[PDB]
Design a binder for these strands. Structure first.
Ligand SMILES: [Mg+2]
Ligand SMILES: [Mg+2]
Ligand SMILES: [Mg+2]
Ligand SMILES: [Mg+2]
Ligand SMILES: [Mg+2]
Ligand SMILES: [Mg+2]
Ligand SMILES: [Mg+2]
Ligand SMILES: [Mg+2]
Ligand SMILES: [Mg+2]
Ligand SMILES: [Mg+2]
Ligand SMILES: [Mg+2]
Ligand SMILES: [Mg+2]
Ligand SMILES: [Mg+2]
Ligand SMILES: [Zn+2]
Lengths: 136, 101, 49, 213
RNA sequence: AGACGGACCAGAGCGAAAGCAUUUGCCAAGAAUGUUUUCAUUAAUCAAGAACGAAAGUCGGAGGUUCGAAGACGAUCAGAUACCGUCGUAGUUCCGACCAUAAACGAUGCCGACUGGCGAUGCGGCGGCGUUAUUCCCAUGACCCGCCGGGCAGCUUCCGGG
RNA sequence: UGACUCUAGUCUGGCACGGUGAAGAGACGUUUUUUCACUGACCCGGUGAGGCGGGGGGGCGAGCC
RNA sequence: UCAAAGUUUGAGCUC
């Protein structure tokens, strides 16, 4: 975890893959390639209370603690690939998503170019429910 | 009695359309009856961008956008409170309000 | 085998036609006994696949 | 009892000479321990590269995938693999009241590089237009699709890979397409939304190094 | 490997009706339009009789990705043999055989005539300053302002009815 | 046959036939042992045991002097 | 961005 680059003239980039689901939050640091990882760490290690791991309070706290540890490793710049569950399923990030986001706003990492990358299908397989739907 | 002229849908010349699975539920709704919303929106909305803008490196570097198109089911819509009930008379006023909100 | 007399089969005999003993059987077993369902992992109406 | 990232050895990632800057970035692989070579681990990786790195100061939405099919020496030698437009950009572009027109085509160049090209185009609402629609006819779309394939094959087959990438860096193809379609129906937001390397030929290292000095 | 062809997708089109949307090719058809094209009553509606007719269901193969009747278990709950969950069978896919039932709703049979407007629209046709590409004009294409036929719909009023 | 007492068969560990090298920890210049090879015992299959492996030279194409 | 909420003398209401 040592970028030999000089600090400001140019950045040694990593790339954080921020998964924000409605029941989990991943954080997966990698190289420019992506194939090689530096540090991945999740919330579920840091907080053990099933009901409020995806809670926005939990996802924020998680994002701060995780981003803190990656900064700790000393990577100055990051590419970003925020991602949600996707597919035939939901296209909206869950309640953790946004608390994590604001948390990473205060956390301090130098940010390269951002992009969205949730895998939307052209034409999809059937959603997990009835025809009559998740009813309640 | 006939409650609405179009039966809460837009089927005048056609005859059948493909069903969709709800996002909040999975309730099957005819696409033509189903509510369609094209929501494009900033991955960071307004409060966050001011905070996150502190987190950006470059002074004024544009953010990409989050191009959604949502469909909800009916009971979810009233619950999520997107649409309100209206009177028998106001019902025909099918013009949406201007662009104040 | 069940029809035979109880010399020609280990399931034979009896007044009523019946097997009498369990039809699942070891593979560490001598020639003459190895009979029936060999090393039966399961044994029933195969529900599903 | 050792930190595992000590074993990794780093490598400089190099761009080919048609582009201005060479050293894209740096890539790490475990050192030669056992059968595997760090160069071997490095050889398969793929590099998504920005337009800000291609044009001196410019918008980011064009991308270029680049696998480093061979390692020269404390460096990573990349190769052309496929251009693409960003989701944000295309979905932003794609709005209602306009005949969208796409077309794909597989075709191989003079040099032994086989491509599969994806075009895109949208009908333009005129300034003084009062009909809301601004839609195209179907015959119009079939005409555009056939010309789209004509121009892509005619342009690529007649000239080398260098020329195809140096034309793709601008809108030269989509711009000529806007020229071709302007009589038929004015479309504006013209792009080659995807280009795709398919089957490379046998690697002649003297050719690769001539491209790299 | 098999489903599915998003977004472009409209109070839009076509089809006897269910319905019909990945590219390209082949086959034939048809509503509508222009017409000083031919025949000159050849037509409308119909017990009997016939063709088609979503999904589930059934019989054989082929295929078996997802979901998921049945079923089991795990949860809440006074009870739940349900609503929540993890699995999961037949079925869901194709070909070949049956079947003829839906709120198959415009809940409005078919032809034919007459009696108010108004703007918008889709197709074919006609006319008319000017813009704009073909570029170098014509004649075409995109706009633009109109008229004509019938067409999916919309609004409108003490027409009159109910 | 759930009686007593034994037995062919089959399962399992040891010693011998049974070699030549590789790296590591240690082990109780030495090993207990984990992996990685080699081949000469040994084993299998095919052929009326029919053109094997190296080195030149020759040629059809790609790149160089 | 939805776990639930049952009953009520036979002993006399009314143009
Ligand atoms: Mg016996
Ligand atoms: Mg598709
Ligand atoms: Mg129907
Ligand atoms: Mg009859
Ligand atoms: Mg059917
Ligand atoms: Mg059927
Ligand atoms: Mg059957
Ligand atoms: Mg299920
Ligand atoms: Mg139970
Ligand atoms: Mg269930
Ligand atoms: Mg019916
Ligand atoms: Mg309840
Ligand atoms: Mg009582
Ligand atoms: Zn709803």
């Amino acid at each position: 975890s040592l970028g030999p680059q000089v600090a400001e003239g140019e950045n040694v980039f990593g790339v954080c893959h921020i998964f924000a689901s409605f029941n989990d939050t991943f954080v997966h640091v990698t190289d420019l390639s992506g194939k090689e990882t530096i540090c991945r760490v999740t919330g579920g290690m840091k907080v053990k209370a099933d009901r409020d791991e995806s809670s926005p309070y939990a996802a924020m706290l998680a994002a701060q603690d995780v981003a803190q540890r990656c900064k700790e490793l000393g990577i100055t710049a990051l590419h970003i690939k925020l991602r949600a569950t996707g597919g035939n399923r939901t296209k909206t990030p869950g309640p953790g998503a946004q608390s994590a986001l604001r948390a990473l706003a205060r956390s301090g990492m130098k940010i390269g170019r951002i992009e969205d990358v949730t895998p939307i299908p052209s034409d999809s397989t059937r959603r997990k429910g009835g025809r009559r739907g998740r009813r309640l | 009695t006939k409650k609405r002229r179009n039966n809460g849908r837009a089927k005048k010349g056609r005859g059948h359309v493909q069903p969709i699975r709800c996002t909040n539920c999975a309730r099957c709704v005819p696409k033509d009856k189903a509510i369609k919303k094209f929501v494009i929106r900033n991955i960071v909305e307004a409060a966050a961008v001011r905070d996150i803008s502190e987190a950006s490196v470059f002074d004024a570097y544009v953010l990409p956008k989050l191009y959604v198109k949502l469909h909800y089911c009916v009971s979810c819509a009233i619950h999520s409170k997107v649409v309100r009930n209206r009177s028998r008379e106001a019902r025909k006023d099918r013009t949406p309000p201007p662009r104040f909100r | 085998g069940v029809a035979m007399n109880p010399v020609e089969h280990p399931f034979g005999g009896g007044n009523h036609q019946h097997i009498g003993k369990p039809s699942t059987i070891r593979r560490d077993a001598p020639a003459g006994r190895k009979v029936g369902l060999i090393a039966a992992r399961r044994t029933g109406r195969l529900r599903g696949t | 009892v050792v930190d595992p990232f000590s074993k990794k050895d780093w490598y400089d990632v190099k761009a080919p000479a048609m582009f201005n800057i060479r050293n894209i970035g740096k890539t790490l692989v475990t050192r030669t321990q056992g059968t595997k070579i760090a160069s071997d681990g490095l050889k398969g990786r793929v590099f998504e590269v920005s337009l800000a790195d291609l044009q001196n100061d410019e918008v980011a939405f064009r991308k270029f995938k680049l696998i480093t099919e061979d390692v020269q020496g404390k460096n990573c030698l990349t190769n052309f693999h496929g251009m693409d437009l960003t989701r944000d950009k295309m979905c932003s572009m794609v709005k209602k009241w306009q005949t969208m027109i796409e077309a794909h085509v597989d075709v191989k160049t003079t040099d032994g590089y086989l491509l599969r090209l994806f075009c895109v185009g949208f009908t333009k609402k005129r300034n003084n237009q009062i009909r809301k629609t601004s839609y195209a006819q179907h015959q119009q779309v079939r005409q555009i699709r056939k010309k789209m394939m004509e121009i892509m094959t005619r342009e690529v087959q007649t000239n080398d890979l260098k020329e195809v990438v140096n034309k793709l860096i601008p809108d030269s193809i989509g711009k000529d397409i806007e020229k071709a379609c302007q009589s038929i129906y004015p479309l504006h937001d013209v792009f080659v939304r995807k280009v795709k390397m398919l089957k490379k030929p046998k690697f002649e290292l003297g050719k690769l190094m001539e491209l790299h000095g």
